[PDB]
Amino acid sequence: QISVRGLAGVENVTELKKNFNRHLHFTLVKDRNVATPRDYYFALAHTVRDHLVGRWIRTQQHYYEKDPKRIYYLSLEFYMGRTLQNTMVNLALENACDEATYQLGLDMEELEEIEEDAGLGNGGLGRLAACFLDSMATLGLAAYGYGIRYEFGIFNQKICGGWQMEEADDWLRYGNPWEKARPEFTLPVHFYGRVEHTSQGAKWVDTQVVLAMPYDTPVPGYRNNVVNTMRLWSAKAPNDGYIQAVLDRNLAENISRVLYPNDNFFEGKELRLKQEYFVVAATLQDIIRRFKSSTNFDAFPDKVAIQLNDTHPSLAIPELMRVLVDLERLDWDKAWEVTVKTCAYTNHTVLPEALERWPVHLLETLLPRHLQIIYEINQRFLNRVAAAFPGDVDRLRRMSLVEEGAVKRINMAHLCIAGSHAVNGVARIHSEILKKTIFKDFYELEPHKFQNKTNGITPRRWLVLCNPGLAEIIAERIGEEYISDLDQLRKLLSYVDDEAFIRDVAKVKQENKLKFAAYLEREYKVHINPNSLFDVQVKRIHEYKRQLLNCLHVITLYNRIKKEPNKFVVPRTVMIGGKAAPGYHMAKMIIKLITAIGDVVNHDPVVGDRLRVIFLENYRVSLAEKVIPAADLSEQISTAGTEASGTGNMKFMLNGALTIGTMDGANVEMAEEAGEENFFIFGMRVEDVDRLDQRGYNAQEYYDRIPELRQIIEQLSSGFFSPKQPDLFKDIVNMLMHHDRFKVFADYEEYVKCQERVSALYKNPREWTRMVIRNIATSGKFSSDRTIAQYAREIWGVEPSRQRLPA
Amino acid sequence: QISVRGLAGVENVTELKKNFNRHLHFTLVKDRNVATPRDYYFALAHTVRDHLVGRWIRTQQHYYEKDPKRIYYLSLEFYMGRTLQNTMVNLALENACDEATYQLGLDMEELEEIEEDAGLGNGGLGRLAACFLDSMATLGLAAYGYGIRYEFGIFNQKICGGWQMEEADDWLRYGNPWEKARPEFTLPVHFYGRVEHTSQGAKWVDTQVVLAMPYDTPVPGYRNNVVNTMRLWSAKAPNDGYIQAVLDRNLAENISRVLYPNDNFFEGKELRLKQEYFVVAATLQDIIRRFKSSTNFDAFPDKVAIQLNDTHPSLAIPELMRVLVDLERLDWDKAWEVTVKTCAYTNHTVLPEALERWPVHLLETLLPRHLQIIYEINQRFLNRVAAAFPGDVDRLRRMSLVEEGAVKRINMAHLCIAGSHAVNGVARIHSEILKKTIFKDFYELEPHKFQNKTNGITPRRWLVLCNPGLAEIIAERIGEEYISDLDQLRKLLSYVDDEAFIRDVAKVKQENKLKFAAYLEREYKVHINPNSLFDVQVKRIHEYKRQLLNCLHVITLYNRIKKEPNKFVVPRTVMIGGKAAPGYHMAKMIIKLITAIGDVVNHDPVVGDRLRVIFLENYRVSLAEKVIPAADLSEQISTAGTEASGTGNMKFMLNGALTIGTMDGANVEMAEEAGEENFFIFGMRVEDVDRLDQRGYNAQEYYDRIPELRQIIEQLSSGFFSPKQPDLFKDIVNMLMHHDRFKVFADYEEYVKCQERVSALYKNPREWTRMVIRNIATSGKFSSDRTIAQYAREIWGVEPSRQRLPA
Numbered sequence A, B: 001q002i003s004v005r006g007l008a009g010v011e012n013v014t015e016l017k018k019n020f021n022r023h024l025h026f027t028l029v030k031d032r033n034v035a036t037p038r039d040y041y042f043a044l045a046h047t048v049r050d051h052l053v054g055r056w057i058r059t060q061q062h063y064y065e066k067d068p069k070r071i072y073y074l075s076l077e078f079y080m081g082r083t084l085q086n087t088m089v090n091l092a093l094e095n096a097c098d099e100a101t102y103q104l105g106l107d108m109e110e111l112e113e114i115e116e117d118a119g120l121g122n123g124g125l126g127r128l129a130a131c132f133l134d135s136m137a138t139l140g141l142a143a144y145g146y147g148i149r150y151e152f153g154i155f156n157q158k159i160c161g162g163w164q165m166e167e168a169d170d171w172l173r174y175g176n177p178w179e180k181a182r183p184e185f186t187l188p189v190h191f192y193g194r195v196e197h198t199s200q201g202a203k204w205v206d207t208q209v210v211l212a213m214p215y216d217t218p219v220p221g222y223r224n225n226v227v228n229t230m231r232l233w234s235a236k237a238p239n240d241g242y243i244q245a246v247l248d249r250n251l252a253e254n255i256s257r258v259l260y261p262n263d264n265f266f267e268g269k270e271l272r273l274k275q276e277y278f279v280v281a282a283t284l285q286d287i288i289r290r291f292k293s294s295t296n297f298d299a300f301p302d303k304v305a306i307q308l309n310d311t312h313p314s315l316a317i318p319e320l321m322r323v324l325v326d327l328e329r330l331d332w333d334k335a336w337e338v339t340v341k342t343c344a345y346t347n348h349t350v351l352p353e354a355l356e357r358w359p360v361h362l363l364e365t366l367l368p369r370h371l372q373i374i375y376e377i378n379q380r381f382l383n384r385v386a387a388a389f390p391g392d393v394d395r396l397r398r399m400s401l402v403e404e405g406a407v408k409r410i411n412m413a414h415l416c417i418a419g420s421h422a423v424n425g426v427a428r429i430h431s432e433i434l435k436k437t438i439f440k441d442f443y444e445l446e447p448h449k450f451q452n453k454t455n456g457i458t459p460r461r462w463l464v465l466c467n468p469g470l471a472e473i474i475a476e477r478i479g480e481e482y483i484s485d486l487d488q489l490r491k492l493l494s495y496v497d498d499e500a501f502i503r504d505v506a507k508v509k510q511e512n513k514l515k516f517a518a519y520l521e522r523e524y525k526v527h528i529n530p531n532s533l534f535d536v537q538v539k540r541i542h543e544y545k546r547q548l549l550n551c552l553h554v555i556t557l558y559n560r561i562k563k564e565p566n567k568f569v570v571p572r573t574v575m576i577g578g579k580a581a582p583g584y585h586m587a588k589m590i591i592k593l594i595t596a597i598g599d600v601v602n603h604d605p606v607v608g609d610r611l612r613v614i615f616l617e618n619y620r621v622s623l624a625e626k627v628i629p630a631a632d633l634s635e636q637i638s639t640a641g642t643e644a645s646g647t648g649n650m651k652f653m654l655n656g657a658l659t660i661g662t663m664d665g666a667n668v669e670m671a672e673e674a675g676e677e678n679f680f681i682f683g684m685r686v687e688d689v690d691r692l693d694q695r696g697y698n699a700q701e702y703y704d705r706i707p708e709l710r711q712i713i714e715q716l717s718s719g720f721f722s723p724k725q726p727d728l729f730k731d732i733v734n735m736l737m738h739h740d741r742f743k744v745f746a747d748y749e750e751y752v753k754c755q756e757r758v759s760a761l762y763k764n765p766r767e768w769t770r771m772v773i774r775n776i777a778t779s780g781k782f783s784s785d786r787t788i789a790q791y792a793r794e795i796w797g798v799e800p801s802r803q804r805l806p807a
């Protein structure tokens, strides 16, 4: 149908139909009379998977022959979403499969909806790892993603009576056709025990053993025949009254059972620590095995890079030291040099509650030898600090890996900086914040370590896959090369006055909105005006992200309409979605507030179809692929200094929405790329937030001086949005008035004014679309191909390549 | 190579090689450079599995079109063993696959050894169900085996310091290529809750739900293109703080986690009761669904037969009543008629400790509605008894389903008899014992219900598969038809004086013994004389089976040699193997005694290679396939009246061993078929045991009057076989002298004398072999094809067929 989806060659289509029928018969053991839509999905998945296999085997043997430096991306989260369409896109099989399935009397898009998301992440950090794997494969890097194969991923969210309920995400229930179990590469992981000091050195003994069984998933590059591996570990009990002993195997296997559902919040639970060590211990043995199968560990950093995704895999540092010192018998100083040159650390947030600080008593019991190694690292590190800054005793305590207090804790971020040759933030403003505030001491000691690597998103999933209509009209003008060279979108600036292109851009958006409006009615029986401005905020629910600020604007619009009902206003559909961590009460109250506002606004006859408020249930990767292409306005409204980067922001920019946002995270760079005239910027800058903190934030001041704000708070308190439970939102009001860390009231006036300017521009379709074209055209910097190329050249010391392997 | 293994056609071999390479590449994602022997096994298994699929689909659609009466064999155990070779044998693919793999540079027998046993049974009862599935498919019956897919089967036995250690049988670790998950047929099973009585009847409410997910395994008939299904249920939690809630899903899923390892012993544990209801509830819903997809339940017994394998699935009776009365709204009397005509019950033992008697308080809590239905059944049943035998109040209490006492219990055997139209024992003597003793009251009320169905074994697995050499020399004389018509072996009687046949029979045995003697040295580094008489007792370790009587003989032989070292004796290798239930102390002591005797006997220089005692570790189906063909003497020495049938006995008879045995179980019929002159019969008959019980068994009498026996007991007590632990076997001696339920001493003299006659005959190879030929020739009755044909005609009301479906 459309060119960017590839060729539907007669032979290809014939062969796909044949192999589809083969799998339906031999693999699924079905015939067309009893086959369910799910059977058809699986037959297609197996058919597409067959085309990966040759390339996968050839890629891995190519790496063995050439022996390039290997990149190991360690993460507790990989938010992959669905795999079928992505694989077709990267293998240029989409049109052929569409044709093949059409000839068999099937609708391929219907089959695609059957696939479960691989929801092995919480949000942005997990999704970044997924985009990164795609870009590493597309750039021909010998890269491996290493993580945990959670039996249960991020919970499915149901909304009951306006409240979030959590349901287990049993994503493996029907099987996963993409993974290949590799039980032959099973490795032991040790826990507990004690340290014995001998003549030959330290020995870690009397441990409990859990087995780590790997499952490999292929990661195809974009039309380059490279297929890399994501290896995820699953916990298995070793095979050594009777019934209870067998049942108790569950205890060991619980390590890989479930993803911790906390976004930007540290929970110091033992099971989480076990997960972190489990992935690190299994992965490092695998790395070392692969390295030896190429004694001389001097060359280890030349053949191995380990990227630590946040501090979650920080135990890699002392584990690598443990193996090199206790098992390989290297001297400490040599082992340390190898470790530092091998490891690099990426920080993803400065929120204090997100920082991992593990109680010493936990490490003492679970990982006694690692604790010893951490103390040794700390002593040697602090000796360097003392030598560089003689007499500065407070710096010593500020920089220590060990935090003193009620309970002693290890600061894992400090461990990561000490043990890595490179430390990066994920957007320019964030990386500057790291050097100026939380890691200032470390920057002063080792400034060469500190870098920036601004985040990105893969344009395969986030344009070609989710928005083929837009990909096509772009390709019609500038060709297909931009899909793996997103900077080429700049060429679209010469079409900003092109009447045909303006018309096409606007038509594609309208089509996307109609499709999404239909999806809502079918799957959720809710009716929306497709001619309204689609105002979308989708991301995890958190105070710092300020869904509450959005809520205040929505209530402002509602109150203004009620005050002057017969005055024209630009119709809006305000869509908010995202999951709250199960134990985060305020986030759950925010979800309830949004639905409560919807209940009032959506049933007020005077409002009509001029304002609608919808809570998008179960926001996840597959839903992002639907809603983002349909959005007109992207809400990126975190308090300045809190969103390290954001990546949702980049997705909306690429898909033809305009952005209303603070100068926070990557928004700063997005505005810089597009021009501030083409961005709806409002609110405090970081410096303004600092000034307010110095004199003290008093929310009452804003309440006292802004009558429209006062009205809203009075409505909330009095039970306007909760008639039968008048005090339901008192916690929200109390927080806003007395304990608001994120200064919601301080940005309210500028936000509302800025939103009026959004409405003004939307009334002029042509100028709206021209500004959109200016955004899409300057979105190139935010390709994860650019991000990964920078990691490769500036941290890993390897050169990317766009050359293809033989098919 | 040999004809009974089928044709190796050039096209077949070419196609098998092609599909093998296809699976290695696409299914296993390997190439020949990195492929492990296990990968090669899986490639072959998938290749052979492909040939089942068409036949499997066609068989099931054939049953749908013809709508024959369906047979449902309900069992908690299916001891399947390995599947690869069996499938090849039944599809006539063995030689073709051997050729194909040979041309690829692989040894097929080596690949076969990689497959794990499906050890979903304890021993004889579980293996009977497996043989029965094979025969039902071979006889073209529309039959389904229904059970539980245990994650862990019968434990792997290791011997450490002469003691049994148990290891978890993680049989699914590398995957099971034979099964197909059918998540679309998942069914809810209910537990706990309470009964509510309404105007519309009883309602079972507030239950906890566990999901039952079926996995289907194909069961191929012998070269008839029939492929039936064994459906095994796996327990799954439904999808509805957070972390602990997810982890607690394990509790529901524990139902299908592990096989209870008790052989002939009832353990009244709640988890076991849950397993029993789980299989029954899921299976009956599946049966009813299939029945409705052909309201009028009058025809239910014409289209459905349910065979209860022991009392383990006895809850089928009240569950069927529950569904018919509570859900389908049939009146009680009609529901009962349907239930009785649908259900039939097979009793497998009379040992009192094996009988299921469930505490009422357990049923009350777990299955409150079933308890109510059981009481109602009991009241109506006892009203019939009272009417038939007026005034006989003791009969009423003897026949009650409810047993009074300290704890009230339900007698599940009584429930089964009341609710079934047919009750059978498993050998003629056993069925007579049922009518004369334990179910005498029931027989008097309903004599028409009571039947015999003498057990059998499948000659596919137990001759063609495990002993191709013997199958071939038989086929050379009388053709191949005997493999599905075992009565044709009678034709071998006309070769009993044929010098060539005598030579061939003896050569095949010698070859089997050499092969097994080699297996011992390779896998267990133990050296045995292959010219010795192979004296084998393999079966679960139990007092009633009297491994101890064997031990007494072995020590007698040893003492006689030590007394007259330079006298000639027929050399023997005495092999004993089998598992003990983990909580059965005496059985574990027996294993320790056997190894302790071996330690002394095997290292005594004066004995030399004249006597060896070996404990066969980890006795299981795959080991039975090796040792049984190598055996000369089969030990079947249970106390008369205790072994309901035995089936190991039949396996040895078919494979050219002579039998030393009591007149117990099927031994009686085996002796009857072969002639008592061709059997080594010894010991008390049932009537003799009864006489001894009447006057009281005094073991001291035998100790006092048999000096050879006295010496052995003195050796045991004094520490001759345990120097460093002199009193190790005091429990054994104490039991033998004072608390021996199985009268070991009473059969000692006759056993030893009988064993002397065995040795005498073995010294005359020609006459030994002629007697062997007379056994093999009369083994036809003990084909499970004969057994199943009798079930079909006399219980299920269906006609077997040897006609083949189209290929």
Ligand SMILES: N=C1NC(=O)[C@]2(O[C@H](CO)[C@@H](O)[C@H](O)[C@H]2O)S1
Binding pocket: A123, A124, A125, A126, A128, A263, A264, A265, A348, A349, A426, A455, A643, A644, A645, A646, A647, A665
């Ligand atoms: N636990 C986190 N989750 C995120 O999304 C974080 O990482 C993302 C990827 O770098 C960033 O874009 C987000 O700003 C940050 O909150 S940190």
Ligand SMILES: N=C1NC(=O)[C@]2(O[C@H](CO)[C@@H](O)[C@H](O)[C@H]2O)S1
Binding pocket: B123, B124, B125, B126, B128, B263, B264, B265, B348, B349, B426, B455, B643, B644, B645, B646, B647, B665
């Ligand atoms: N729990 C049991 N295990 C058996 O082997 C039993 O059933 C077999 C099959 O009918 C019989 O051959 C055995 O004699 C009997 O012990 S009963």
Ligand SMILES: *Cc1c(COP(=O)(O)O)cnc(C)c1O
Binding pocket: A122, A123, A124, A127, A538, A539, A540, A619, A620, A621, A624, A645, A646, A647, A648, A649, A651
């Ligand atoms: C991109 C993405 C995120 C991150 O969005 P932000 O707005 O940057 O927080 C979260 N969840 C999903 C499902 C995503 O696709």
Ligand SMILES: *Cc1c(COP(=O)(O)O)cnc(C)c1O
Binding pocket: B122, B123, B124, B127, B538, B539, B540, B619, B620, B621, B624, B645, B646, B647, B648, B649, B651
């Ligand atoms: C046949 C068989 C049995 C039953 O043997 P008996 O001697 O009848 O108790 C037990 N275990 C296995 C593995 C078998 O193959």
